[PDB]
Coordinates of C-alpha atoms in Angstrom, one line a residue:
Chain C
X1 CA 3.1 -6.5 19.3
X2 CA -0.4 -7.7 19.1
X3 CA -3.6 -8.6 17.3
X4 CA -6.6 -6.7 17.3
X5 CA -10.2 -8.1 17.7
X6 CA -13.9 -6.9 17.7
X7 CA -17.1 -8.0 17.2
X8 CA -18.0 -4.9 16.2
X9 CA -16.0 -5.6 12.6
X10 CA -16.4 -8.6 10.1
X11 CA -14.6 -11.5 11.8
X12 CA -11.0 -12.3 10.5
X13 CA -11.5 -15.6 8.4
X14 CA -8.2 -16.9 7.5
X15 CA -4.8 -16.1 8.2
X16 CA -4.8 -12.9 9.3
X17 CA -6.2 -10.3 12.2
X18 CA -8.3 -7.2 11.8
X19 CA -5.7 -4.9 12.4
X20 CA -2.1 -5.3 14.1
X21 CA -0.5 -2.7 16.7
X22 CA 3.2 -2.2 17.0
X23 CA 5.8 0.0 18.9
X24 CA 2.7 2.9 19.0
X25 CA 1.1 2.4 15.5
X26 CA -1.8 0.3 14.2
X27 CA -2.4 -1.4 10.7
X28 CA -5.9 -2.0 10.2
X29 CA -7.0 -5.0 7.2
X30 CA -8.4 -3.4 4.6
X31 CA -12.3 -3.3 5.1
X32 CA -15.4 -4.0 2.9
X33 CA -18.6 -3.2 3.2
X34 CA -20.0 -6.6 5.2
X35 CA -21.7 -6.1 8.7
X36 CA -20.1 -7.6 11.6
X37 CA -22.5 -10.5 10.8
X38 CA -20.6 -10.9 7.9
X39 CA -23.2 -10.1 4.8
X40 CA -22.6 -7.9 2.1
X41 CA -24.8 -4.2 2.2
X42 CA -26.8 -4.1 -1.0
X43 CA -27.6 -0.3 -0.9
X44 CA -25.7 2.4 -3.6
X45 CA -21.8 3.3 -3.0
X46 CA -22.6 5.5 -0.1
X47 CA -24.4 2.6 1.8
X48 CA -21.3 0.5 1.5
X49 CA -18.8 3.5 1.8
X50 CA -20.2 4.0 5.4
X51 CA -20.5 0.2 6.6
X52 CA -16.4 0.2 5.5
X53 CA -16.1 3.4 8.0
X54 CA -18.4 1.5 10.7
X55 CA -15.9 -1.4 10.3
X56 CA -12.8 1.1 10.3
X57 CA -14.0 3.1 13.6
X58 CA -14.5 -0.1 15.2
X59 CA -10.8 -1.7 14.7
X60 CA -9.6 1.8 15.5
X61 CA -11.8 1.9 18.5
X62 CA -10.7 -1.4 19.7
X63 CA -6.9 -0.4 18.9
X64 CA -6.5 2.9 21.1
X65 CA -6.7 4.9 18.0
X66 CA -9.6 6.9 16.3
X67 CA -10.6 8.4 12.7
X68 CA -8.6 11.6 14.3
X69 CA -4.9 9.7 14.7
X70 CA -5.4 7.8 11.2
X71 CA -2.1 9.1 9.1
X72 CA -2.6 7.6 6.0
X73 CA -5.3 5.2 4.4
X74 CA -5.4 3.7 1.1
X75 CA -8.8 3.4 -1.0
X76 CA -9.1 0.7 -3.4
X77 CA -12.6 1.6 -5.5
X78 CA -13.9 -0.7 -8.0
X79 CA -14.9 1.9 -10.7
X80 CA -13.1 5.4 -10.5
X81 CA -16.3 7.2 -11.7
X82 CA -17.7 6.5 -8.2
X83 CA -14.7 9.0 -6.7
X84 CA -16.9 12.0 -6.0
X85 CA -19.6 9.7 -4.5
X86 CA -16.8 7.7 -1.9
X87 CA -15.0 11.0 -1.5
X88 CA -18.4 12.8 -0.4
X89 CA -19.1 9.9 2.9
X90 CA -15.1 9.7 3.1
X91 CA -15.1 13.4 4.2
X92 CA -17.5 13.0 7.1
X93 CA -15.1 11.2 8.9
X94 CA -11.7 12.4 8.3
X95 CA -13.4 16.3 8.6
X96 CA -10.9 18.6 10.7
X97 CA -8.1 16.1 10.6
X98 CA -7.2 14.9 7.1
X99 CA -4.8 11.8 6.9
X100 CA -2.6 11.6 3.7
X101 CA -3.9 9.1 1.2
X102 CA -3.9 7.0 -2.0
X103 CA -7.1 6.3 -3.9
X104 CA -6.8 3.6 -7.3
X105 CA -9.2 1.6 -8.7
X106 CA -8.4 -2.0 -9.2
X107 CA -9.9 -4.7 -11.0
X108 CA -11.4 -6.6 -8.3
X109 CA -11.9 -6.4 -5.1
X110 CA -13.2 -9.4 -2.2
X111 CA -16.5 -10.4 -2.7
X112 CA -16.8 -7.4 -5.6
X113 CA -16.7 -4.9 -3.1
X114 CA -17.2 -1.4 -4.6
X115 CA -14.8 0.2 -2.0
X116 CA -12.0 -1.2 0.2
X117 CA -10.2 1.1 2.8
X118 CA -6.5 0.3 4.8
X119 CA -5.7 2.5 7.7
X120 CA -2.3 3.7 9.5
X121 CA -3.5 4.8 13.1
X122 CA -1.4 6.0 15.8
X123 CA -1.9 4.4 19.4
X124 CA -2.2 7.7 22.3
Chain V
X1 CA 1.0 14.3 14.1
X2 CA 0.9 17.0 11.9
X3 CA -0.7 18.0 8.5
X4 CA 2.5 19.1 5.6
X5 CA 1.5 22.0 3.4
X6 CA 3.5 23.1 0.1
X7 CA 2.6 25.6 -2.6
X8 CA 5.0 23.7 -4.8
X9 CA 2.8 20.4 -4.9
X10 CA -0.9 20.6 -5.9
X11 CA -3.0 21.9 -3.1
X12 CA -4.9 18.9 -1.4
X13 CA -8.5 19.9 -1.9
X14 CA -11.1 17.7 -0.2
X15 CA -10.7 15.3 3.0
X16 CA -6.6 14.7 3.0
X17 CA -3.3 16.3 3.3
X18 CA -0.4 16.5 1.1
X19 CA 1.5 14.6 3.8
X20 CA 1.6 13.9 7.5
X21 CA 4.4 13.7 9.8
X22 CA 4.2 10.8 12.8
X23 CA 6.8 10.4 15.5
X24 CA 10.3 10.4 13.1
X25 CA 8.2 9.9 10.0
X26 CA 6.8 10.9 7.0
X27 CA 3.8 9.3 5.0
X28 CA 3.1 11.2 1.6
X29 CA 0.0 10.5 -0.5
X30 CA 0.2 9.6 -3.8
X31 CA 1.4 12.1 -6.8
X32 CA 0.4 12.1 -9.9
X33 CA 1.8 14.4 -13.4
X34 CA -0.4 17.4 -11.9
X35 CA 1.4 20.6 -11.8
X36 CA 1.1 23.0 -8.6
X37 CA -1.5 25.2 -10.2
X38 CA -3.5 22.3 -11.1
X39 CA -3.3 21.4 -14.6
X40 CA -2.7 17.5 -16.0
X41 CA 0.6 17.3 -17.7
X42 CA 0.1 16.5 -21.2
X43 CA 3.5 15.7 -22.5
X44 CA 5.3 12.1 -22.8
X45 CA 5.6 9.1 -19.9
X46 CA 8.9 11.0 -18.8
X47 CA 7.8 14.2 -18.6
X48 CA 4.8 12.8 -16.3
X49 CA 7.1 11.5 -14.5
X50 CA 9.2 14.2 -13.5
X51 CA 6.1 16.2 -12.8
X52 CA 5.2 13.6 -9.8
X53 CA 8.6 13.7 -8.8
X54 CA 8.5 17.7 -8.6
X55 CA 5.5 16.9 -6.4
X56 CA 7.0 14.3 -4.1
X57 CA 10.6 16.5 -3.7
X58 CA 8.2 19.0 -2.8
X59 CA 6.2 17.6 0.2
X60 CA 9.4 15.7 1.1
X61 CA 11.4 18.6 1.9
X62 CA 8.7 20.1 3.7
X63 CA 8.4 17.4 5.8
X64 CA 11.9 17.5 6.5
X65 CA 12.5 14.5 4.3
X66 CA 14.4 14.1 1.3
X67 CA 14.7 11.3 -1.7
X68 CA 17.9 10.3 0.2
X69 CA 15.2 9.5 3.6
X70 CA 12.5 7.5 1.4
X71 CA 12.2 4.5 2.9
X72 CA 9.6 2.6 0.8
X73 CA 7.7 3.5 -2.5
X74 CA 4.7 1.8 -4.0
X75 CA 4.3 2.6 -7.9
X76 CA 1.0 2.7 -9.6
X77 CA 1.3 2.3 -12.9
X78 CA -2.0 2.9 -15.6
X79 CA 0.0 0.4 -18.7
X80 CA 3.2 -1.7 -17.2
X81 CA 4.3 -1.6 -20.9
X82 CA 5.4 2.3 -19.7
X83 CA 7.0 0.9 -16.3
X84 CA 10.7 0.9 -18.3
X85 CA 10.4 5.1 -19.2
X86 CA 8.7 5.7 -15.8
X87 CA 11.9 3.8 -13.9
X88 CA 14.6 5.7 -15.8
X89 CA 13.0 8.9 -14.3
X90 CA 12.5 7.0 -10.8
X91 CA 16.0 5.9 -11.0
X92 CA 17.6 9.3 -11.2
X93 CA 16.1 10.0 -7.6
X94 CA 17.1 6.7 -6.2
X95 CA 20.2 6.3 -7.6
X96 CA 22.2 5.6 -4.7
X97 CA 19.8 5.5 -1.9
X98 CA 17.2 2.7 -2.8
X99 CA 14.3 2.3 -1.3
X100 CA 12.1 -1.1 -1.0
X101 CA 9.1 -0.7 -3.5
X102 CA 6.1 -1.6 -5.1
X103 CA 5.0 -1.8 -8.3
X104 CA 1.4 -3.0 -10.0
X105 CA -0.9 -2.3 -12.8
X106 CA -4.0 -0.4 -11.8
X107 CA -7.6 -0.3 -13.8
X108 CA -7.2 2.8 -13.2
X109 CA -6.0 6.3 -11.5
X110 CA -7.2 9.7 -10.2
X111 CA -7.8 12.0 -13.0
X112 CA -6.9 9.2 -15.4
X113 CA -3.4 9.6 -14.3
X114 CA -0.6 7.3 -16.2
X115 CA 1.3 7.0 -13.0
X116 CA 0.7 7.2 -8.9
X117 CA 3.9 7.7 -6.4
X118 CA 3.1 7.2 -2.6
X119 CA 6.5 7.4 0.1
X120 CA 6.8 6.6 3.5
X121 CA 10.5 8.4 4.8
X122 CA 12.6 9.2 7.4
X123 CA 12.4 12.6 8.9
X124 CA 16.3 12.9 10.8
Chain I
X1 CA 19.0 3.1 8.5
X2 CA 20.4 0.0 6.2
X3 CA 19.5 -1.6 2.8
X4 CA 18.8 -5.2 3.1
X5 CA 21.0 -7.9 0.4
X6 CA 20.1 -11.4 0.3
X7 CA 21.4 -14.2 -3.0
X8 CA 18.3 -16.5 -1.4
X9 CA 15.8 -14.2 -2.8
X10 CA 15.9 -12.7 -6.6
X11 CA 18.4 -9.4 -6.9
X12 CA 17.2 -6.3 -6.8
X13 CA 18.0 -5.1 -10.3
X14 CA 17.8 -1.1 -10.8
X15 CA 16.9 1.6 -8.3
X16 CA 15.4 -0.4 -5.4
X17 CA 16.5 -3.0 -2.3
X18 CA 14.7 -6.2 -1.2
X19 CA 14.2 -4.1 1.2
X20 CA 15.1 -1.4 4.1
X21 CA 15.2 -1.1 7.7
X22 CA 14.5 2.3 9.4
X23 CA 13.9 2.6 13.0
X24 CA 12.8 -1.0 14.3
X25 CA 10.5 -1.8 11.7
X26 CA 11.7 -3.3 7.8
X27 CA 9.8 -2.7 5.0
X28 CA 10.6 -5.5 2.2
X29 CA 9.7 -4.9 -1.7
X30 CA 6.9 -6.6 -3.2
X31 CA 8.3 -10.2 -4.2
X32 CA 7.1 -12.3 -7.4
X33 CA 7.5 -15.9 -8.3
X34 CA 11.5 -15.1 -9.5
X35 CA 14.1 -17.7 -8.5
X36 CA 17.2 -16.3 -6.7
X37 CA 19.1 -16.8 -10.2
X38 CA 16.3 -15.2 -11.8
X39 CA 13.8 -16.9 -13.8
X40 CA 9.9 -17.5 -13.0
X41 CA 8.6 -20.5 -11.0
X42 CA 7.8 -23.3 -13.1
X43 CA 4.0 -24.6 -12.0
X44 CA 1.0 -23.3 -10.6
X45 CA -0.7 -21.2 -9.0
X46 CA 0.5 -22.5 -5.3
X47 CA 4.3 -23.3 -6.6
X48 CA 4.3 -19.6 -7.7
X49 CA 3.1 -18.7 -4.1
X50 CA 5.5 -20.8 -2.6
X51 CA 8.6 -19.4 -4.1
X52 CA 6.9 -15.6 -3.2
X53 CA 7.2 -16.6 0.5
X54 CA 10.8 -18.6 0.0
X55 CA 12.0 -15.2 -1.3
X56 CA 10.1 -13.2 1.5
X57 CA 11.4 -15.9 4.2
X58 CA 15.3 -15.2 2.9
X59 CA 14.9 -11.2 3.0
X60 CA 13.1 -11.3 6.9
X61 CA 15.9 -13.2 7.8
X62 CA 18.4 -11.0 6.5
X63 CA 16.8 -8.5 8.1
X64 CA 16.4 -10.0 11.2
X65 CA 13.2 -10.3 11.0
X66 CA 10.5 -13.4 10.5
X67 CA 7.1 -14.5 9.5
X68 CA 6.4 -14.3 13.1
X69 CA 7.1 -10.8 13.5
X70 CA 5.3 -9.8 10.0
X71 CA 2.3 -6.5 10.9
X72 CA 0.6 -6.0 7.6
X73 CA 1.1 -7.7 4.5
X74 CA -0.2 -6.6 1.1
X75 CA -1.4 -9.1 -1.7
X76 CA -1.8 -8.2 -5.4
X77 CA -3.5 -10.7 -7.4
X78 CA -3.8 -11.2 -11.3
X79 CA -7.3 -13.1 -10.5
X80 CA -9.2 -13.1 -7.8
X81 CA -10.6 -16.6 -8.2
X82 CA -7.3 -18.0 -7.7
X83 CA -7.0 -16.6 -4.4
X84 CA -8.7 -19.9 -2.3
X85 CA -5.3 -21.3 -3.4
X86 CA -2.9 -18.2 -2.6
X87 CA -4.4 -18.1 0.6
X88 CA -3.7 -22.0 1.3
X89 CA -0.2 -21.3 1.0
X90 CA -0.1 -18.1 2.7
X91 CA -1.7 -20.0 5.7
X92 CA 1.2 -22.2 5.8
X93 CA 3.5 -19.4 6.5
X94 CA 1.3 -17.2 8.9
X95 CA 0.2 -19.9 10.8
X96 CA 1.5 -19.0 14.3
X97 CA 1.2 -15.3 13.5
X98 CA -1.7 -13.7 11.7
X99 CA -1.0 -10.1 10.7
X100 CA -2.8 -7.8 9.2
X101 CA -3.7 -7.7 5.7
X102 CA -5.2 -6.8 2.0
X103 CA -6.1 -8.6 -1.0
X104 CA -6.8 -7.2 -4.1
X105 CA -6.5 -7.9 -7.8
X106 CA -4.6 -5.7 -9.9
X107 CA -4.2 -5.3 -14.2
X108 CA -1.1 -6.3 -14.3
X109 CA 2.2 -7.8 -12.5
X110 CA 5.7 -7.2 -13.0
X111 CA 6.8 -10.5 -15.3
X112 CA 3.2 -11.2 -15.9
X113 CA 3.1 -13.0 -12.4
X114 CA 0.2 -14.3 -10.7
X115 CA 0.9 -12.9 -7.3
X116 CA 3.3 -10.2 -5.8
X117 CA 3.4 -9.8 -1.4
X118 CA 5.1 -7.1 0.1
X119 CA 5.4 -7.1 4.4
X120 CA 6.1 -4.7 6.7
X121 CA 7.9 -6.5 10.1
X122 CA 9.0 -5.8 13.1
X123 CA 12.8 -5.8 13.7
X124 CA 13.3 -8.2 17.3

């Protein structure tokens, strides 16, 4: 097993890595909308909805794996009207290949993120 | 990896599948009381219930999974004052096979939903 | 495929295990503050966290498993301003191994705890 790491993704600060591979599979962190720089994005939902993918294809990237081996993500959403809004950017990148998933909102999120997406990738 | 369609669970419209298969498993996404046809089911906590169960049974045996293959569950539950109905349903599906799980009050769910079932399983 | 049993962590009472290992890989249930006979953690914030990872250390080991071999960890949090101190215990525990993870903060908990962690390990 082993620890994933880019600089193209928010730096892990704390007790954990940006994603973990084992046997051929990958568990990203889930990922908010900060810049590798590691600032919030202060645009709408759509704005922050993409930096979260930016983050995501970079740890997938870095992995082996890629937006089209993803098998399942979860999206935590900070107000469930937003849906259509996340669901419109979320379709861009999981177009012809469509991982299974779960979408809640909870109460809060780090740093009151609006969204926070986990992936399940498979390593080629 | 591949994509899992069933008529008997309610058709995955938008930028996901029902479930995927990976290597010698199965990762569902998350049912909630909708029937096949698409309508919210409008009847009591249990009959919810067995309405996300129909789904899951559905996509399981698809996959080539069953109840008796789930693995691990995660519940999302709208009021955890309704968990108690919602796990005498649960436990007539995992009565002898029990798998590790899950369970937390959301804000919220999908279609204002009272209940969310995700499974990961075994496909022998 | 097994169910895992422990009497160092709290039983699982109804239709679930501590948890299950398919494959190489072990999937525990989320824990809560419980004792092994039962009752919530006297204490705060960090004592409840402490007996969360206590009851995650017994079911790893049962497993044959360990915090060292721990891929993605979930948090749910009844408030997310007492996560500085959930996340200076859980530093104490992933120390040497850093997997991946998510925070969020939920509605509710089972018992009205303050914290529930679910892992996914490897199986050495």
């Amino acid at each position: 097993t082993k620890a994933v790491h880019t600089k193209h993704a928010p730096a892990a600060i704390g007790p954990y890595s940006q994603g973990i591979i084992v046997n051929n599979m990958f568990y990203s962190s889930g990922q908010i909308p900060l810049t590798p720089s590691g600032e919030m994005v202060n645009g709408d939902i759509k704005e922050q909805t993409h930096q979260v993918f930016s983050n995501l294809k970079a740890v997938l990237e870095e992995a082996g794996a890629s937006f089209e081996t993803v098998v399942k993500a979860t999206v935590f959403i900070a107000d469930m009207e937003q849906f259509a809004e996340v669901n419109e950017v979320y379709g861009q990148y999981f177009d012809t290949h469509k991982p299974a998933r779960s979408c809640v909102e909870v109460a809060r999120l780090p740093k009151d993120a609006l969204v926070e997406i986990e992936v399940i990738a498979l390593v080629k």
